[PDB]
Design a protein around this ligand. Structure first.
Ligand code: HEM
Ligand code: HEM
Ligand code: HEM
Ligand code: HEM
Lengths: 140, 144, 143, 140, 144, 143
């Protein structure tokens, strides 16, 4: 459950990401596949080599979905309805994998936006990503 | 009984019991889409993220009034709206306590296509950020 | 921890650039702010009411250095993590009653601080190497 | 995130608990302390012997809070605000302990209300308790 | 354009686009507390859990009208309201799509203290439950 | 698993009353419905679209009996869980890629099914004994 402060931290920080959101999304996935190779089993249709056109393309879709989620953080279930259908109903993704992508996203943001990645912002982003993960992994 | 203007400190204006969870539906009104843009022509993300879309054009005898729902109301500080160069009066008509949404109103001229927003946020352990320029561009020119 | 000689070289090389006096306080500090329930275990440290208070707390900084040094000991004895962290495992389990899941959290926070410090230098292949190390240390403490 | 079906399952099932809610709350705690003795460190002020007057009394407060949470399942953060203050801000309870009490509550409900404890109801209650736990363990 | 009555199937009546997210504030109104009781004198938990408190007494020239917010609207089936012995007309005036809340209205006599509810829920894999009796007891007698 | 002789006697006594043909299907069935992501691992079993479909699935029932029997083998060899479940651990890790956390979930679901079956007979001291057994089996599979 996000505080008003948490929501503000996330929105303000994500605004500073901007046009590079697709770049970070791509990099977070690359990190996840390398660090946690069991996550690759969800993308057997992908060529999971480094600099993969599919991974770069998928990163942009993941970033655009996170952007949508941040813009509707007050009511994510309604906003991410089709995405919950995909991940929870169809893919049946194990929640443990969302913790791994979330951590990789935080790693990427810390590396690229160190001035913005304060302790307070870190806290709010981790909390936000955990809420997104619950929504995408729940059948509602 | 006297509270700060929504212009100067929205987070303080919302404490007014006279507008907490108050009804605010109009007789004659129309939904209107809009975009929030920054100084570099990009989407102004914080404001896009922090506003309810669509907004409402309310028709009155004194001219058209725009109603905008602002999210995380307890974090907003300044929220000044300008039509071109001249400063508009911003009124807080309702605050939704359950979701921290503030609904503000300001009058615009007929055929107004854009409105300028100068605003800031202030919260937590002395966290303060100024948004010197945001352009609220309406999907169509405002009428009635 | 099963690391290839190339991964050991990459991990050791970046660890030599680590500001040991600072990185440990930032990792522990962020653990307490990001996962606030962890403050309960460090209530002897004093004021942990705000982020600024935690990061500026000299006992958080002092203890953070102990934790980093513990990780530095872990970079040695990579084929014997269970034995080296045995004494610490018993402390955190029997005396402190810390849940194993929290060890993984601190490990992941350290990795975020490493990325925060090194930026683009903290590449995905390097992170992948550090993930194995932090997972090994976490498991060792849970043993 | 609960579905409309999940909310209905929980409300209907909890209505069949009724006046015995305080009895189950007490029993769930007893089970937690016995099964997971590390949870006893949160109640050093209690006499944690079996049939403890404090544990029986506390069970009723816990049951009444769960009842309140079920009645306001659509917006638990606002309803459980003071309870979040206690558990998240003051007590700083580790989230792992909420999983343990939740499981013990499910065990108690299964034992006392077997006709009501269907697979579908089980699913919704586990999901509900997980949402209550997130609220009580979050600083918002 | 024709939908089932809120009486017979609330979950089907809420699909009507004419009442989805429709404004429904009255000119003259008053908040009123209430309790839901079952046949054994206990609190009827499902109905307490599934209703917005307080309800609203709306004043009209044809008599006082009670407005009740019902939660999990897509799960309710029958929801018949009786004043003593006689069946009251139940009207769905608005459905909140974002939180699945239905707002229904029914007229009562002046000085009415209680109203009887006969209702059911129907959802999921053929799950069906009847609540043959619930007593909605108002905090005060209804006036105006 | 460190169980006192009284706990072993209480655990063994109730396990003799367990309907082995039924309890395993209910535990596995409920795992798939309560924790729906687990259905991914059992997609070869066929129709898992609804609760009624899962509980009525003969392959869920058939496999549930295998899992119970695995637990029955665990009640023997209580001082050597790691060695007995070693072959199953390697299967679930290398071939199936099941996350360790799921083993604890199924263990807790089995306990709920035991309470569902035995009611008041499934007393808190008895549950406490079974919690040690299911935690031991989970850890063994995670090893
Ligand atoms: C931060 C949380 C996540 C977000 C925001 C997200 C977002 C998305 C989006 C936008 C799509 C494409 C939707 C479409 O085009 O129909 C997608 C598909 C997919 N997701 Fe995720 N996802 C998340 C987490 C995960 C995780 C943890 C996994 C498993 C490791 C996963 C596995 C997949 C797979 C296999 C697809 C289909 C790939 C394809 O389109 O070819 N997702 N996700
Ligand atoms: C892999 C991660 C961790 C490492 C390497 C580590 C290491 C250490 C070390 C070296 C000490 C000093 C022992 C001494 O004074 O001789 C210590 C103590 C302590 N640890 Fe950890 N630890 C870790 C994770 C955690 C976590 C997650 C918690 C709780 C959330 C925790 C709570 C404590 C506490 C409360 C003390 C005692 C501090 C004092 O009284 O001065 N540790 N740990
Ligand atoms: C189902 C989730 C839980 C609910 C609904 C709940 C409910 C409550 C309530 C109603 C109170 C008393 C509030 C007051 O009188 O001011 C309380 C206090 C307390 N809770 Fe919880 N609780 C939950 C989980 C937990 C857990 C997991 C723990 C740790 C094991 C815990 C530890 C405590 C302690 C130590 C107190 C203070 C005891 C006292 O009043 O003397 N709670 N809780
Ligand atoms: C302590 C809990 C568990 C026990 C005792 C257990 C035991 C077993 C046993 C005895 C088998 C049969 C192996 C064979 O065919 O020779 C098996 C297979 C299998 N297990 Fe588990 N298991 C457990 C938990 C889980 C969990 C949590 C999952 C995933 C959520 C899982 C997924 C599978 C799958 C997919 C198979 C293969 C089924 C088939 O292809 O017929 N198991 N396990």
């Amino acid at each position: 459950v996000l505080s008003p402060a948490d929501k503000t931290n996330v929105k303000a920080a994500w605004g500073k990401v901007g046009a590079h959101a697709g770049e970070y999304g791509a990099e977070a996935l690359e990190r996840m596949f390398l660090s946690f190779p069991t996550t690759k089993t969800y993308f057997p249709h992908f060529d999971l080599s480094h600099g993969s056109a599919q991974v770069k393309g998928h990163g942009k879709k993941v970033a655009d979905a996170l952007t949508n989620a941040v813009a509707h953080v007050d009511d994510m279930p309604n906003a991410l309805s089709a995405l919950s259908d995909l991940h929870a109903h169809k893919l049946r993704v194990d929640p443990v994998n969302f913790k791994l992508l979330s951590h990789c996203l935080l790693v990427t943001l810390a590396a690229h936006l160190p001035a913005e990645f304060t302790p307070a912002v870190h806290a709010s982003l981790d909390k936000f990503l955990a809420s997104v993960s619950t929504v995408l992994t729940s059948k509602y | 009984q006297q509270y700060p203007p929504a212009d100067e400190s929205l987070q303080d204006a919302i404490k007014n019991p006279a507008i907490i969870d108050k009804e605010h539906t109009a007789d004659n009104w129309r939904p209107i889409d809009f975009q929030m843009k920054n100084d570099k022509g990009e989407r102004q993300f914080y404001h896009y993220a922090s506003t309810v879309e669509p907004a409402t054009v309310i028709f009155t005898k004194t001219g058209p009034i725009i109603e905008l729902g602002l999210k995380t109301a307890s974090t907003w500080k300044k929220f000044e709206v300008y039509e071109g160069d001249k400063k508009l009066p911003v009124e807080l008509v309702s605050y939704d306590s359950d979701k921290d949404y503030a609904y503000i109103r300001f009058p615009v001229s007929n055929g107004t296509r854009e409105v300028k927003i100068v605003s800031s946020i202030e919260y937590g352990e002395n966290i303060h950020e100024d948004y010197d320029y945001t352009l609220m561009v309406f999907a169509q020119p405002i009428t009635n | 921890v099963h690391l290839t000689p190339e991964e050991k070289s990459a991990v050791t090389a970046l660890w030599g650039k680590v500001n040991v006096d600072e990185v440990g306080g930032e990792a522990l500090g962020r653990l307490l702010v990001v996962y606030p329930w962890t403050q309960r275990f460090f209530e002897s440290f004093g004021d942990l009411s705000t982020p600024d208070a935690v990061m500026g707390n000299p006992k958080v900084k002092a203890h953070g250095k102990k934790v980093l040094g513990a990780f530095s000991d872990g970079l040695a004895h990579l084929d014997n993590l269970k034995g080296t962290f045995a004494t610490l495992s018993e402390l955190h389990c029997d005396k402190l009653h810390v849940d194993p899941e929290n060890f993984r959290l601190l490990g992941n926070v350290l990795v975020c601080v490493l990325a925060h410090h090194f930026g683009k230098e903290f590449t995905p292949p390097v992170q992948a190497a550090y993930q194995k190390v932090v997972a090994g240390v976490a498991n060792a403490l849970a043993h």
